[PDB]
Amino acid sequence: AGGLEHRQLLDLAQKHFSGLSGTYDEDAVPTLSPCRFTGSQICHREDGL
Amino acid sequence: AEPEHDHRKRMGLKMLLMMGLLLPLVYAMKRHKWSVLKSRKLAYRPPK
Ligand SMILES: CCCCCCCCCCCCCCCC(=O)OC[C@H](COP(=O)(O)OCCN)OC(=O)CCCCCCCCCCCCCCC
Numbered sequence A: 001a002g003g004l005e006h007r008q009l010l011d012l013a014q015k016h017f018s019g020l021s022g023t024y025d026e027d028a029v030p031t032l033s034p035c036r037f038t039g040s041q042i043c044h045r046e047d048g049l
Numbered sequence B: 001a002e003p004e005h006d007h008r009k010r011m012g013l014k015m016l017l018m019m020g021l022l023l024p025l026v027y028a029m030k031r032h033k034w035s036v037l038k039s040r041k042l043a044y045r046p047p048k
Helices: A006-016 B005-038
Strands: none
Touching: none
16 A cells, blocks of 8 residues: 555566465365354452552 | 131142242252352462
8 A cells, every 4th residue: 555556566466476375285275163152251350450 | 627628728739839830940040040150160370
C-alpha cells in the first residue's frame, strides 16, 4: 500500500517469489479443525496485586 | 372415631406420588447448581 503501481509489485513477485513451493504434500495439507467453546471460569486469586 | 379415614388414605396416595416426582427433580436442581463447585479444580502456584 502506498505510491506504487500494481504492475511492478507483480513483477517483483514473479521475480523473487517464483522460487517457492506451490505443490503441497500428498496428504499433509493442514486443515483447521473447529474449536469447541466451553462455558467455564478461571480465577487466579492474587490479593498482592 | 375417624370419619376422615378414607379421604386421608386417598390424599396419602397422592402425597407419595407427588413426592416421588418432586424429590428427584428438586434433588436434580440442587446438584445442577452445585455441579459448578463439585467439579471445580484447584491449583497452588506460589512464587519461588
Ligand atoms: C393461606 C394458606 C396457608 C397455607 C400454609 C401451608 C403451609 C405449608 C404446608 C405444606 C403442606 C404440604 C402439601 C399438603 C398436600 C395436601 O394435603 O393436599 C392433598 C391433595 C389432594 O387433595 P384431594 O384428594 O382433596 O383432591 C384435591 C382436589 N382436586 O394432593 C396432595 O397431596 C398434593 C401434595 C403433593 C405432595 C406434597 C408436595 C409438597 C410441596 C410443597 C408446597 C407447599 C406450598 C406452601 C404453601 C404455603
